[PDB]
Amino acid sequence: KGILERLNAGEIVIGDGGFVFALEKRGYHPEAVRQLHREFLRAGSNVMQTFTVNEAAADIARQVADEGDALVAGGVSQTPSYLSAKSETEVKKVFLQQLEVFMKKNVDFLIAEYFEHVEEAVWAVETLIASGKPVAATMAIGPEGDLHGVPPGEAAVRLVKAGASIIGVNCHFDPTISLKTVKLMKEGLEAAQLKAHLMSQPLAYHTPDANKQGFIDLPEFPFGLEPRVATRWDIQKYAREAYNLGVRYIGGCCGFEPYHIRAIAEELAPERGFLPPGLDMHTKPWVRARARKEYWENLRIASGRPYNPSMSKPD
Amino acid sequence: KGILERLNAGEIVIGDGGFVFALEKRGYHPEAVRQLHREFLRAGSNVMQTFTVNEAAADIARQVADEGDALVAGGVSQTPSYLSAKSETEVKKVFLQQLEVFMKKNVDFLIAEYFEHVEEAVWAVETLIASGKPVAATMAIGPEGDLHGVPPGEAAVRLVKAGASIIGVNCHFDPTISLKTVKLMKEGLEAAQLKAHLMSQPLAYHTPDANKQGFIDLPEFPFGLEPRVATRWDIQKYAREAYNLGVRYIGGCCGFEPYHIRAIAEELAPERGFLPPRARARKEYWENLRIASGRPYNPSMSKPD
Amino acid sequence: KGILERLNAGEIVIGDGGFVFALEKRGYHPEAVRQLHREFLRAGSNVMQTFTVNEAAADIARQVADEGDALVAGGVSQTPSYLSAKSETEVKKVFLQQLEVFMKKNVDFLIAEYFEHVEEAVWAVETLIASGKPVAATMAIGPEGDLHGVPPGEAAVRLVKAGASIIGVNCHFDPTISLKTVKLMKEGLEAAQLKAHLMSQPLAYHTPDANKQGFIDLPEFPFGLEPRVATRWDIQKYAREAYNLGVRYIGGCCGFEPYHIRAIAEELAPERGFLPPRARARKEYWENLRIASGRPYNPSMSKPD
Amino acid sequence: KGILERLNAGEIVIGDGGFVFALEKRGYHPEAVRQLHREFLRAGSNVMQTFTVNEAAADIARQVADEGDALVAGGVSQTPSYLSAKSETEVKKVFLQQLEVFMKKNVDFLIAEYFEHVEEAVWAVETLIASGKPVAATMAIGPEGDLHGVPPGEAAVRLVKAGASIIGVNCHFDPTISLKTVKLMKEGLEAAQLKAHLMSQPLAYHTPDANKQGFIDLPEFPFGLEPRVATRWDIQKYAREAYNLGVRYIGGCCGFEPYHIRAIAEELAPERGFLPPGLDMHTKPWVRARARKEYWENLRIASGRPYNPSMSKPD
Ligand SMILES: [Sm+3]
Ligand SMILES: [Sm+3]
Ligand SMILES: [Sm+3]
Ligand SMILES: [Sm+3]
């Protein structure tokens, strides 16, 4: 079953969140890459991504995807070259080169991931639909819109018009700010009487202090982000709210690890009809008392850093 | 080089801190276990631990240790029998039991790991040395001592007298509180004219709010600990302080992942002699950045239950 | 010098910010009222406010104002009648009512203080100018505007058109959010070719967690606000920013005590020309010290109810 | 009724906390001093203090004390001259000079306040009892003892032996650390089979981060302490716990204002049989919901400073 088939039938598709983030974190060896893909699959991901040999990358993904109920998706991000002034025919040529690797490896679908400029997001979708494969487009923007002042609603409209059947947001903000952005996008599609499936790949980092440029501008980016990491409970709340908003492609970006994906899969186990592939016996009474979801759902966890602030100023 | 030859040759032994926590976190598949081991070895760990299939765990650990400059260590922790009050010979029997397997698999050394009672740790040391292999003993206690009131200085002295060639602290507090405990253990050994290598396997979780029982009593244990996780800069400061205090077997316990081990190897790359296998590009910015929690609606500390 | 002569002569008018909050805090005795007034005048305030016995309040204020370089001002705030939906002529009547007393006691000027609705503020301005005395109008709104959605730029324009010689913001947010609102009010007046003196009477409580309704909706209002209190360094930064933005009637509202007013006078002593009546000895240490809350078990922000 | 009479009958005596702190805060004029004394009396204080003309100071205190149920107490603090090496006969001469002003003005009792060295605290009590007036002694020390390593228990013992009928702690730590110190003192008196009334004049500032030197060593001392100020609820909890510990002279030191004293008086209004000399009608429902002691007693108030830490390192 393909990605549009699943989603058209109202299924909840779970992404393989921060694959790249995790490979980075682990210090990367096909075995290392195959093992990570497997952890995401075991956690419940229905998508195994590959990027940009590029062919071995695609092979390993396909290999693990065949071990469960998952698809292989090829992703492309913004060229770093747009800031390099050079953009246009040059941009589509790069996308085109990557499109070939993917068609050649016969991926299940494509994702225009990481894009801060709608204009460039569009060029990507235009090039990608020429494969005849389903295309998903996400924008690395918050409620205020992209780098040109293009609002989320309008960005959503233009991406669908360009041919994306799945739109959403990713990689710049935490789950809460990301879903607010997706709500804006959803309202853009409604007002324009257009339809598309929605997806969200938020950061697993809390970013209440970020400005419109996202977490990259926080002073802790990228080596002091540990304190902000979402617990599994934070992610279950995100999964539930995403589900309630109409999001059906629920994933994650930087900060996401297999256990965050498993939390999504477990939170939505009822709705999905299945679970992805002993605290109550602990010796201490007060520890046993924590073996109840309600306890964690209501606990305001401490940071453990009394000498540090709870927020920082961007820049 | 054996564990003791390394240490006597002035080398820094990097532990594979967090092994069990990582597998638990990744959700566990010999390949899954083999990969995790490789990550630690690749991060610079000189020890691949193995516990209690048993023959398999020991075999995978040995295979990855073979792949690099690492030893395999057999770990033993506090037993239910002792807490369930069977004491004496009875407790010595389960360790002997465990030893057997580590004997047959021929592990390089043994660690009496995770003991909240000095007494039971001693009984563990006395049993493990019957293996003729070097024995390391670590206590899950803080500056205030073990569960019967035995202070760190004394605990260190009884562990060495019992035959441990390496002693220290592990798994109950963050790096700073753990090293203060180690300092107390070291002053004890000195006041007693005793000598032994020191080790530390602290939590990678900041724990300023814990009482003498350790992080377990904190209400966030074990599923709400994320905010407390040490950054690599916190870990590098820990490695540096540990080295300066005289610690030469530097590892970690719950919360330590491979990247934390790697921070230790890089920090101490000059003292070791090699590395393990825009203004934010400067290490001193990170060493001085008071990172934010990102959780303004949450407290900074909790009271232990 | 009258309020308007002072301002046109380039002077900085220091308000007696916090008067009601202080008396409320001290628990209220004409002597008690007279002393509080003296504290503000002694801290540098150039205005002694009076509201609504009435003749007494006005008399005590005048006596202390007489003692120094201060004016007496009659304050009027949003009425229940307007919120209780009587609007139009009815609301104008209670202000006229209030004016009467301030007319007989001969106060120096009038302030339409504390209005969450531009419309009712205008009706207040239109009534108060019938006194022939200068009228100041301040809004209890933030950057997002009043309760009907009227933005700061527009609110400022309608208040001046209505006859207010002085406009600004008061009592709903901390100094920074209040001055951002003032900046918006100033851009409105500019886009409309209008001119008027500006004033600010912010809360002395830090309020980063409030929504458009102001600090009242925070769960700590009104008895758990202590941690939020501005230090004198926070107040000096506010005075300096207010001056730089062009504000010349600089006061405060809830939370401001005499020492906060004094911080304003000292900060601006060079721009005024006089003062009001071991490495911690340096002002730049205080200007840079990120003070601790002393409440590690409490959050740093709360969600408005 | 005198101070020993009240306390011997088991009455709860309420101090006039941070009189000096408050006068400082207000920028100081007999009228200013009389008004402050009155606010404390109106708040419930049974003691009006005067210090070190000194005579006018004593007159005003007496004057206001006569307006209610209060006594006038003369207080003496450590000489700053002990750090000036000069100490002994020199110290008692200063105390003696002050003792005369007070006997001359006929105060009701005397307080050896602010003392960081037990040795010097003792000299003060020795000089002061020579007036035939009741003497109270407090130490500015925490659980670890004074500047010489003299523990609280022993300090308590020596002060009583020197002639103090009332002992306690003050001016260096918050209510919680101060009462722990008083508990230690109380245990010292018990073990030595001695008896004395207990008193506490803690800071109204939370100081969980202070070292044995007290709040003077925190970096915010003395101009950045605002965030630490106790709410009236924090003080009611202190009053109740002080009462439960056996403390019967309940006061305060730096940071205390009349409203903190009133909170003590109200918390203990039942036990005392009287109160010292409209939120529920507020327009907003959620505001009306706060007119219940339980709400405040259970509310973990926010600091309002997300960009600041919750604790600082001493020094
Ligand atoms: Sm390589
Ligand atoms: Sm939220
Ligand atoms: Sm299984
Ligand atoms: Sm530290």
Ligand SMILES: [Sm+3]
């Ligand atoms: Sm009355």
Ligand SMILES: [Sm+3]
């Ligand atoms: Sm600011």
Ligand SMILES: [Sm+3]
């Ligand atoms: Sm003077």
Ligand SMILES: [Sm+3]
């Ligand atoms: Sm407490």
